[PDB]
């Protein structure tokens, strides 16, 4: 098994360092995937420019239209997808609305039955969510 | 375990707890020394002569009587071989295998055995060089292995 000598620290350290790359967590954290390959740069939130709206089909055993939106990030111009939490707000969220996006919870993995979605809308046009659904605050003029 | 084999044989010799010559064996500790010197004058192996005193002469372990080993006695008396016994025997075996290999060119098993002997002879030579029983510059030679054995 593992060496158990009083002067085997170099062997133990070298083996631990070499095998540490096997773990997905260590590999991700040290390869900088959260900045290079990720749509963000490690940011918790970001702003984007809306492109269009997509009714992505739901995988088995479900089948639904989730009124997601295709957005273009302001800082990079790349095209990604976003999810609208509130119901029936598709008419409220239009294109080129200067939307605000955040993560979903799995740190870069698809949610539920909809493949290709990792970001959700937190604020839209600067008015935010949770207000246009209860009619507490209306959208501003543009 | 065996150095270069999978065997685990334990055959050896169990020296007696006593460290004294037998009652009737009045070897007088000097006639045996003269016999050892005569047996070494011809040039027989120190192990082989020790066998001869054990079997023919009837002498017990020579240390129990003479007080010194066979190698030590002849070294003190000056009849010290240029190379150690195990070193010389391994070089002899290595030389014989190489002489067989240069004739039989299709013996890969013998070549492997030669490689094992070369590893064994080098490790023994390294130990003897460290212990100082040989001159520090004792690089073993493959071409002059015939010189080293003889």
């Amino acid at each position: 098994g593992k060496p158990a000598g009083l002067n085997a620290a170099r062997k133990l350290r070298n083996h631990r360092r070499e095998e540490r790359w096997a773990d997905a967590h260590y590999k991700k954290r040290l390869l900088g995937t959260a900045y290079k390959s990720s749509p963000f740069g490690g940011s918790s939130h970001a702003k984007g420019i809306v492109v269009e709206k997509i009714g992505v089909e739901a995988k088995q055993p479900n089948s639904a239209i989730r009124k997601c939106v295709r957005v273009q990030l302001i800082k990079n111009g790349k095209k990604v997808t976003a999810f609208v939490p509130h119901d029936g707000c598709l008419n409220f969220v239009d294109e080129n609305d200067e939307v605000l996006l955040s993560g979903f919870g799995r740190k870069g993995k698809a949610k539920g039955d909809i493949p290709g979605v990792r970001f959700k809308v937190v604020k839209v046009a600067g008015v935010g969510l949770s207000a246009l659904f209860h009619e507490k605050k209306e959208k501003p003029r543009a | 375990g065996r150095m270069h084999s999978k065997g685990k044989g334990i055959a050896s010799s169990a020296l007696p707890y006593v460290r004294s010559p037998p009652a009737w064996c009045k070897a007088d500790a000097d006639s045996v020394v003269e016999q050892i010197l005569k047996f070494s004058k011809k040039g027989m192996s120190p192990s082989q002569i020790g066998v001869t005193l054990r079997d023919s002469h009837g002498i017990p372990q020579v240390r129990f009587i003479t007080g010194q080993k066979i190698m030590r006695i002849l070294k003190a008396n000056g009849l010290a071989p240029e190379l150690p016994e195990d070193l010389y025997n391994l070089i002899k075996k290595a030389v014989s295998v190489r002489k067989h290999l240069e004739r039989n060119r299709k013996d890969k098993d013998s070549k492997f055995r030669l490689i094992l002997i070369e590893s064994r002879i080098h490790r023994l030579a390294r130990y003897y060089r460290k212990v100082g029983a040989l001159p520090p510059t004792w690089k073993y030679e493959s071409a002059t292995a015939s010189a080293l054995v003889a």
Binding site: A4, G5, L6 | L15, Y17, R19
Partner: protein, 129 residues
């Protein structure tokens, strides 16, 4: 090749105790083994043991009286300071009142409690309880 005769001695002792045998034979013998056996015999875990003295490293026959749950060696022998004794006791010993850790300190081979009284650390040899 035998790397440490103390490990073989303690493994033989614990194996015999698990088997329930009242006597055990240890080969070979050394001063470290004798000192370790003296420590556990003084603490009461080991009965009389006799050292057979042949023209070799020697042999030991130990009378086992039970009351031993496990005796083992700690290899490699880490250097143990005064403040490390508590950590070793927590890691190895069942409790703070049961079990003994044997250290080869500057003043000799003795138990962890005696070494703590001596106010001197050393190297950890093994444990028994």
């Amino acid at each position: 090749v035998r790397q440490s005769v103390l490990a073989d001695c303690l493994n033989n002792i614990v194996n015999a105790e698990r088997r329930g045998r009242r006597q055990v034979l240890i080969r070979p013998s050394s001063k470290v083994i004798v000192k370790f056996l003296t420590v556990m015999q003084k603490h009461g875990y080991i009965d009389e043991f006799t050292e057979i003295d042949d023209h070799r490293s020697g042999k030991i026959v130990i009378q086992l009286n039970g009351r031993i749950n496990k005796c083992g060696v700690i290899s490699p022998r880490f250097n143990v300071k005064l403040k490390d004794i508590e950590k070793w006791v927590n890691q190895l010993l069942p409790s703070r009142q049961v079990g003994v850790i044997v250290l080869t300190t500057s003043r000799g081979i003795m138990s962890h409690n005696e070494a703590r009284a001596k106010d001197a650390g050393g190297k950890i040899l093994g444990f028994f309880y």
